[PDB]
Amino acid sequence: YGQSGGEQQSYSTYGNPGSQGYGQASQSYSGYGQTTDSSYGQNYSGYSSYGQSQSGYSQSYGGYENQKQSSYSQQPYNNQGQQQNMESSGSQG
Amino acid sequence: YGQSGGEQQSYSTYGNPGSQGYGQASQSYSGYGQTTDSSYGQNYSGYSSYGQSQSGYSQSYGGYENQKQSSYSQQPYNNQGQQQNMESSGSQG
Amino acid sequence: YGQSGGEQQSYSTYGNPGSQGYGQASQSYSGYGQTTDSSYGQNYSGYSSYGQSQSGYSQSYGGYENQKQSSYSQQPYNNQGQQQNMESSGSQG
Amino acid sequence: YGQSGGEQQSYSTYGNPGSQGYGQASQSYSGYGQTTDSSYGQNYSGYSSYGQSQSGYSQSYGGYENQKQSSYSQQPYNNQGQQQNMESSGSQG
Amino acid sequence: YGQSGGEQQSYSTYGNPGSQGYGQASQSYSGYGQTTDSSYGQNYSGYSSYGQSQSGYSQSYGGYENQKQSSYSQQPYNNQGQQQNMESSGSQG
Fold this sequence. Notes:
Largest interface: A-B, 93 and 93 residues
Structural class of chain A: mainly beta
Radius of gyration of chain A: 24 Å
Entry title: TAF15 amyloid fold in atypical FTLD - Individual 1
Chains A, B, C, D, E: TATA-binding protein-associated factor 2N
Number of strands of chain A: 12
Helix content of chain A: under 10%
Largest sheet of chain A: none
Shape of chain A: flat
Assembly: pentameric
Keywords: amyloid-forming protein, neurodegeneration, RNA binding protein
PDB class: rna binding protein
Oligomer: homopentamer
């Protein structure tokens, strides 16, 4: 068995991800068929090439700017980061 | 058995990830078929090439700027980081 | 058995990761089939090449700047780092 | 058995990681099939090449700058680092 | 048995890691199949080559600068480091 308290998870991405998977992907083979000279796939996100395919994938991006001041800025304030606060959330027999 | 308190997890990325997987990927073979001269795949994120495929994947990015001042800045304040605060969250028999 | 208090985990990346996996990937073979002259894969993130594939993956990035002042800055303040604070979170029989 | 207090973990990376794995990867073989002249893989992040594949992976990056002043800076203040503070978090019978 | 107080762990990297693993990787063989003229792998991060693959991985980076002033700086202040503070966190019978 196992007993755990509450759970907080936080994810932040500042940038261009090529692909993102968040959910559940399942691929199961419980049968007893024949796969011969073949290929099969599950592509949840991103890029899969199989069979006798001929393909190409290009992703091109310009620049990325985050919390940026161009010339002649007067006392800019830029704040970022992660803060975790936990109280009274230990374990007790 | 196992007993744990609360849990906080925080993730931050400042930049361009080629691929991100966050969720659950499962691939199971419980059957008893034949795989002969074949290939199969689960691609959750990112890039998979199999079968007799001929493929290519290019990702190209410009620059990245974070908490940046161009010329002639007067007393800019740039703050980042991680702070963890925990109180009264130990274990007790 | 095992008893633990609260848990805080914090991750920060300032830069371009080629691939990131955050979640759960499981690959199981509980069956009793034949795999002959074959290949199979689970690709959670990043790059997998198998079968008889011919492929290529290129990632190209420009520069990276973090907490940066161009010329003629007057008393810039740049702060980063990690701070952990723990109180009254030990163990007690 | 084992009893522990609270736990704080903090990770920071200033730079371009080729691949990052954060979560759980499991690969299990509990069956009794035959793998002959074959290969199989789990790729959680990063790069796996097997089967009869022919592949290549290139990652190219420009420069990296962190807490940087270009020419003619007046009394810049750059601060980074790690600080751990612990109070009253020992063990007691 | 074992009793421990609170635990703080802090990791910082200023530079480009080729690969990073943070989480749990498990590879188990509890079955009783035959692996003949074969290879299999778990790649959590970084680079694995097996099977009859032909592959290459290149990572190329420019320079790295941290807490740097270009020419003509007036009284720059650069601070980094690690500080650990512990009070009243010993053991007691």
